[PDB]
């Protein structure tokens, strides 16, 4: 080298795209069991991602969500249009393919057609708190008897997906895979790295593990 | 000149452009000052951490024996106690420490590190130890005589309760060695168990650099 | 906070996209019953939208209409072209698939082909009045004996839709869904919020309702 | 650098760009000044509105009994008349009022609000009431003695015909309480029905803030 480093900035230690989920849904009537599908935004799903966001106790960031979507027919039509709807937390949600929760005016939605560069949009920092909390040590209720940890803290919206075309002969099944990255990170208060494999996706519960590998003898 | 040049349609992960915003209305929560802020990952690489030295087979499962090494009156002068390869990121004696764990997110790093010895015995115990360092590309000393002729710091316990060696020229076998040797046997006040201990701590020193991010090897996939 | 708010501006309380209609039409001859379809522009169709535009007595704005359109064939060709025609109020209108009202030169029209980003265009403020009226209290005729409320006030054009290709074997059915948002709103004179569910789409008619929920007793 | 970066083809609701115009000729109607103009929704949140206090089961269907609370000579001192949770947007006593209805279009809000009491009895009636306020996270007073030791304003009817309490620190159970208590029984001139009434009004006070739009819960779908 010849100057101060800049590959170990907080902004470059984070802010890398990663797969976080994928899901399926297929053309069909509202009767059909799977014909819309949803994913709740959380960063605790993927172990690798989770590790690097438990380096810090508090974070605030905007995030970008890009969905890349493919489709294939199955054994024996016009180009399909897909709708991706973001529901901010505390909004209405659909329970079926046809509802007035897809017609609601306060839920952002992206209409996108195949053969175009994949849809994306950013979601700005949302929370009444001044940072997301990656550790919490309280209860939901005002007397201790609530739910321990991750209560109303770390609550973000959720996506929904459906086809926008009418059903037509021959089912089409789509697979949409979600990529996620934060941007404009700021971190406050560091933590020691996690040492034990994750168990639950909502608790810090762990099974005891050895600190380190054995050696053949301490002397050289 | 055109805007449809090769590679203008594609989604390339780790490529930065602007993006439209879902809500271009709400976005407003004022930031407040919060004590302690991290803006670089070398601000937590220069923090001391207790490294485990003692590794047996159950002195590291229950690991409150992992961080401390026995001493005794029984042992004779000129026998070594511990020693290690000195190569953080591949030697399990300091690669699961706070400092060492940061260097498993990068490939190729350099700088210097500094180790610290702390004697935690009684306040009437006095001995002398000969700490030693071997340059990279030379084997560990085989005798206290050999060790002495190398680089060595005679550390008197009974004056100093700690010593700091700052070892330059680490980067990634060949690599140095750190070894501790009795020079004298410990002198007990009247203690009937001659158990005295010392711990060791480690941290990165001053300038340090890393390049090229990669994923850690210590967590394996999802499971839920 | 630390400064004056700006999420409760009139411009951000309105000016959000919302679904307002959708309709269907299909390839076919002029004989065929459904082969073109229309929608009259009004903002009283959707209850949720209607609520927030009856907050004020007078409004003036430009509007943007985006139509996102999908299509599917049905059981057993070149890319289809769709025409969307805006007819300003007091223009000629078609009564069938083939007329000189699609060939008229004074009606804006958008030709659009599938596999492109959805068509849209804005319509500028149109009315001889200086504001739209969301409440009116007169009669159409110069002597009271006309039609009460919403007479020649709140009259805007209407859209028409058809395929532009010739009929060909195998019917294609399209579904076009309309999104609407105003922009550059200005409001004058506020109103108290509506309390009773809407009945007619052209009257302020209502069925009496309780003011508020019951309580178990007024004392604590 | 290119114009075909990921997310450049898509229609994203609530994303603002220019658009071509259907008529780029006609567009012309000159604006005129019109009395009264609203440019912010806190200009109609600071307007008083009569809140319903009395809720029975048909004293709020016919709702001209909903806005007023009986008083009598019969009642003895130190018995409360009304009281409420004090939490607009979730307590039906002030969430269908003009002010309260604006806060169902947002999630998370803060500021202060001010309530107003108006005695509407006869001009020869005189009594004394003890108004009271309990901080959030403390139950309602259970006695006039309890209420008195809290924050209280002794409001003499027969001098003042109204009182304004400005209550800070509302935001969204835990939340304060407002309670009114007899201190003395009302003194009638000679009236043979001892019915006297008081109303209550509410409005947001000074600074107020809301963030993050969402749809109201009080209208359900289309039906035509």
Short mmCIF file of C-alpha atoms in Angstrom, two decimals, chain B:
data_model
loop_
_atom_site.label_atom_id
_atom_site.label_comp_id
_atom_site.label_asym_id
_atom_site.label_seq_id
_atom_site.Cartn_x
_atom_site.Cartn_y
_atom_site.Cartn_z
CA UNK B 1 -22.06 7.21 -29.74
CA UNK B 2 -25.14 5.39 -28.52
CA UNK B 3 -26.83 4.17 -25.35
CA UNK B 4 -27.40 0.59 -26.55
CA UNK B 5 -23.73 -0.46 -26.54
CA UNK B 6 -22.99 -4.13 -25.55
CA UNK B 7 -23.72 -4.82 -21.89
CA UNK B 8 -26.31 -2.07 -21.48
CA UNK B 9 -29.10 -4.58 -20.88
CA UNK B 10 -28.32 -6.96 -18.09
CA UNK B 11 -28.52 -7.07 -14.34
CA UNK B 12 -25.07 -7.27 -12.84
CA UNK B 13 -24.88 -7.85 -9.10
CA UNK B 14 -22.55 -5.39 -7.38
CA UNK B 15 -23.16 -2.61 -9.86
CA UNK B 16 -24.53 0.66 -8.58
CA UNK B 17 -27.12 2.83 -10.26
CA UNK B 18 -29.99 4.91 -8.95
CA UNK B 19 -33.40 3.34 -8.59
CA UNK B 20 -36.93 4.81 -8.25
CA UNK B 21 -38.40 4.95 -4.75
CA UNK B 22 -41.51 3.13 -3.59
CA UNK B 23 -42.53 6.02 -1.40
CA UNK B 24 -41.27 9.43 -2.49
CA UNK B 25 -43.38 11.07 0.22
CA UNK B 26 -42.68 9.38 3.54
CA UNK B 27 -38.98 8.84 4.24
CA UNK B 28 -38.72 11.11 7.23
CA UNK B 29 -37.40 10.15 10.61
CA UNK B 30 -34.72 12.58 11.87
CA UNK B 31 -31.40 10.99 12.84
CA UNK B 32 -30.21 11.48 16.42
CA UNK B 33 -26.70 11.16 17.75
CA UNK B 34 -26.03 7.75 19.34
CA UNK B 35 -22.84 7.13 21.42
CA UNK B 36 -20.21 4.99 19.68
CA UNK B 37 -20.04 4.72 15.93
CA UNK B 38 -18.08 2.40 13.70
CA UNK B 39 -17.06 3.61 10.26
CA UNK B 40 -14.22 1.23 9.53
CA UNK B 41 -13.58 -2.37 10.52
CA UNK B 42 -10.06 -1.63 11.76
CA UNK B 43 -11.64 0.12 14.71
CA UNK B 44 -12.61 -3.29 16.09
CA UNK B 45 -9.48 -5.07 14.90
CA UNK B 46 -7.24 -3.09 17.23
CA UNK B 47 -9.19 -4.08 20.33
CA UNK B 48 -7.56 -6.62 22.66
CA UNK B 49 -9.10 -10.03 23.09
CA UNK B 50 -8.09 -13.01 25.18
CA UNK B 51 -6.75 -15.74 22.94
CA UNK B 52 -7.04 -19.40 23.99
CA UNK B 53 -3.65 -21.05 24.23
CA UNK B 54 -4.41 -24.26 26.06
CA UNK B 55 -6.02 -26.87 23.83
CA UNK B 56 -6.46 -30.42 25.08
CA UNK B 57 -9.79 -32.07 24.30
CA UNK B 58 -12.08 -30.81 27.06
CA UNK B 59 -10.02 -27.85 28.18
CA UNK B 60 -11.72 -26.08 25.28
CA UNK B 61 -15.20 -27.54 25.54
CA UNK B 62 -15.36 -26.10 29.00
CA UNK B 63 -13.20 -23.25 28.00
CA UNK B 64 -12.34 -21.51 31.23
CA UNK B 65 -9.24 -23.65 31.20
CA UNK B 66 -8.69 -22.73 27.55
CA UNK B 67 -7.39 -19.26 28.30
CA UNK B 68 -4.75 -20.07 30.89
CA UNK B 69 -1.63 -22.17 31.12
CA UNK B 70 -0.31 -23.87 34.26
CA UNK B 71 3.02 -23.13 35.86
CA UNK B 72 4.59 -25.07 38.71
CA UNK B 73 7.58 -25.25 41.01
CA UNK B 74 8.07 -28.87 39.90
CA UNK B 75 9.27 -27.94 36.41
CA UNK B 76 12.95 -27.26 35.90
CA UNK B 77 14.51 -24.28 34.15
CA UNK B 78 14.95 -24.42 30.40
CA UNK B 79 11.74 -26.22 29.50
CA UNK B 80 9.34 -24.35 27.26
CA UNK B 81 5.75 -23.56 28.09
CA UNK B 82 3.51 -23.16 25.04
CA UNK B 83 4.43 -21.74 21.64
CA UNK B 84 2.59 -21.29 18.39
CA UNK B 85 2.98 -20.88 14.64
CA UNK B 86 2.03 -17.19 14.62
CA UNK B 87 -0.14 -16.89 11.57
CA UNK B 88 -3.64 -15.58 12.23
CA UNK B 89 -6.35 -16.89 9.95
CA UNK B 90 -5.24 -20.48 9.71
CA UNK B 91 -3.83 -21.34 13.12
CA UNK B 92 -6.49 -22.19 15.65
CA UNK B 93 -5.13 -20.43 18.66
CA UNK B 94 -5.96 -16.92 17.52
CA UNK B 95 -8.16 -17.24 14.43
CA UNK B 96 -11.42 -17.37 16.40
CA UNK B 97 -10.42 -14.32 18.43
CA UNK B 98 -12.02 -10.94 17.84
CA UNK B 99 -9.15 -9.66 15.73
CA UNK B 100 -8.58 -12.93 13.91
CA UNK B 101 -12.20 -13.34 12.91
CA UNK B 102 -12.15 -10.17 10.82
CA UNK B 103 -9.39 -11.56 8.61
CA UNK B 104 -11.50 -14.49 7.46
CA UNK B 105 -13.64 -12.06 5.48
CA UNK B 106 -10.68 -11.11 3.32
CA UNK B 107 -7.96 -12.74 1.32
CA UNK B 108 -4.50 -11.22 1.59
CA UNK B 109 -3.75 -8.81 4.38
CA UNK B 110 -0.63 -7.38 5.96
CA UNK B 111 0.58 -5.24 8.82
CA UNK B 112 1.90 -6.02 12.26
CA UNK B 113 0.23 -7.42 15.36
CA UNK B 114 1.20 -7.28 18.99
CA UNK B 115 0.79 -9.94 21.63
CA UNK B 116 0.61 -9.28 25.33
CA UNK B 117 1.44 -11.55 28.24
CA UNK B 118 -0.10 -11.02 31.64
CA UNK B 119 0.99 -12.96 34.70
CA UNK B 120 -1.96 -13.56 37.01
CA UNK B 121 -0.23 -15.42 39.87
CA UNK B 122 0.13 -14.25 43.48
CA UNK B 123 1.77 -10.99 44.49
CA UNK B 124 4.60 -12.75 46.31
CA UNK B 125 5.52 -15.03 43.41
CA UNK B 126 8.66 -14.11 41.50
CA UNK B 127 10.33 -15.81 38.56
CA UNK B 128 11.97 -14.96 35.28
CA UNK B 129 10.94 -16.05 31.83
CA UNK B 130 12.72 -15.72 28.55
CA UNK B 131 10.35 -14.81 25.74
CA UNK B 132 11.65 -15.49 22.28
CA UNK B 133 10.84 -14.80 18.68
CA UNK B 134 12.15 -16.60 15.62
CA UNK B 135 12.11 -14.86 12.20
CA UNK B 136 9.95 -16.46 9.45
CA UNK B 137 11.63 -19.28 7.56
CA UNK B 138 13.48 -20.58 10.58
CA UNK B 139 12.34 -23.39 12.88
CA UNK B 140 11.47 -23.00 16.55
CA UNK B 141 14.42 -23.03 19.03
CA UNK B 142 15.12 -26.46 20.52
CA UNK B 143 16.89 -25.38 23.71
CA UNK B 144 16.79 -22.30 25.93
CA UNK B 145 20.36 -21.73 24.76
CA UNK B 146 19.14 -21.61 21.16
CA UNK B 147 16.26 -19.31 22.08
CA UNK B 148 18.54 -16.92 23.94
CA UNK B 149 20.82 -16.40 20.95
CA UNK B 150 17.78 -15.41 18.86
CA UNK B 151 15.67 -12.35 19.60
CA UNK B 152 14.58 -12.53 23.18
CA UNK B 153 13.24 -10.33 25.91
CA UNK B 154 13.98 -11.35 29.47
CA UNK B 155 10.78 -10.60 31.31
CA UNK B 156 11.06 -10.44 35.05
CA UNK B 157 7.87 -11.25 36.86
CA UNK B 158 8.12 -9.36 40.12
CA UNK B 159 8.66 -5.98 38.50
CA UNK B 160 6.59 -6.09 35.35
CA UNK B 161 3.23 -7.77 35.35
CA UNK B 162 2.95 -7.63 31.59
CA UNK B 163 5.07 -7.36 28.49
CA UNK B 164 4.13 -6.38 24.97
CA UNK B 165 6.02 -7.68 21.97
CA UNK B 166 5.16 -6.01 18.70
CA UNK B 167 5.98 -8.43 15.94
CA UNK B 168 6.37 -7.00 12.44
CA UNK B 169 6.09 -8.76 9.13
CA UNK B 170 2.99 -10.96 9.21
CA UNK B 171 0.96 -11.50 6.08
CA UNK B 172 -0.68 -14.40 4.30
CA UNK B 173 4.20 -23.24 6.34
CA UNK B 174 6.76 -20.49 6.85
CA UNK B 175 6.14 -17.88 9.51
CA UNK B 176 7.83 -17.10 12.83
CA UNK B 177 7.42 -18.66 16.23
CA UNK B 178 6.76 -17.31 19.66
CA UNK B 179 7.97 -19.45 22.52
CA UNK B 180 8.20 -18.86 26.24
CA UNK B 181 10.79 -20.65 28.35
CA UNK B 182 11.60 -20.90 32.02
CA UNK B 183 14.82 -19.16 32.95
CA UNK B 184 14.28 -19.90 36.61
CA UNK B 185 11.61 -21.89 38.39
CA UNK B 186 8.92 -19.85 40.17
CA UNK B 187 9.50 -18.94 43.81
CA UNK B 188 6.46 -19.60 45.97
CA UNK B 189 5.71 -17.67 49.18
CA UNK B 190 4.48 -20.80 51.00
CA UNK B 191 1.65 -21.83 48.65
CA UNK B 192 0.92 -25.53 48.83
CA UNK B 193 -0.45 -25.74 45.30
CA UNK B 194 2.08 -24.14 42.96
CA UNK B 195 -0.54 -23.26 40.38
CA UNK B 196 0.14 -19.92 38.83
CA UNK B 197 -1.15 -18.88 35.48
CA UNK B 198 -0.65 -16.50 32.66
CA UNK B 199 -2.99 -15.40 29.94
CA UNK B 200 -2.25 -13.91 26.56
CA UNK B 201 -4.11 -11.30 24.54
CA UNK B 202 -3.68 -10.19 20.95
CA UNK B 203 -4.69 -7.30 18.75
CA UNK B 204 -3.69 -5.70 15.47
CA UNK B 205 -1.19 -2.91 15.82
CA UNK B 206 -1.29 0.44 13.99
CA UNK B 207 -1.57 0.28 10.18
CA UNK B 208 -3.24 -2.78 8.74
CA UNK B 209 -4.82 -3.43 5.38
CA UNK B 210 -7.11 -5.95 3.78
CA UNK B 211 -8.27 -6.34 0.22
CA UNK B 212 -10.89 -8.35 -1.61
CA UNK B 213 -13.99 -9.50 0.27
CA UNK B 214 -14.95 -13.17 0.50
CA UNK B 215 -17.28 -15.22 2.67
CA UNK B 216 -16.32 -16.76 6.01
CA UNK B 217 -15.89 -20.50 6.41
CA UNK B 218 -17.26 -20.85 9.95
CA UNK B 219 -21.00 -20.99 9.22
CA UNK B 220 -22.51 -23.54 6.89
CA UNK B 221 -25.77 -22.82 5.08
CA UNK B 222 -29.32 -22.34 6.33
CA UNK B 223 -31.07 -24.97 8.41
CA UNK B 224 -34.44 -23.35 9.06
#
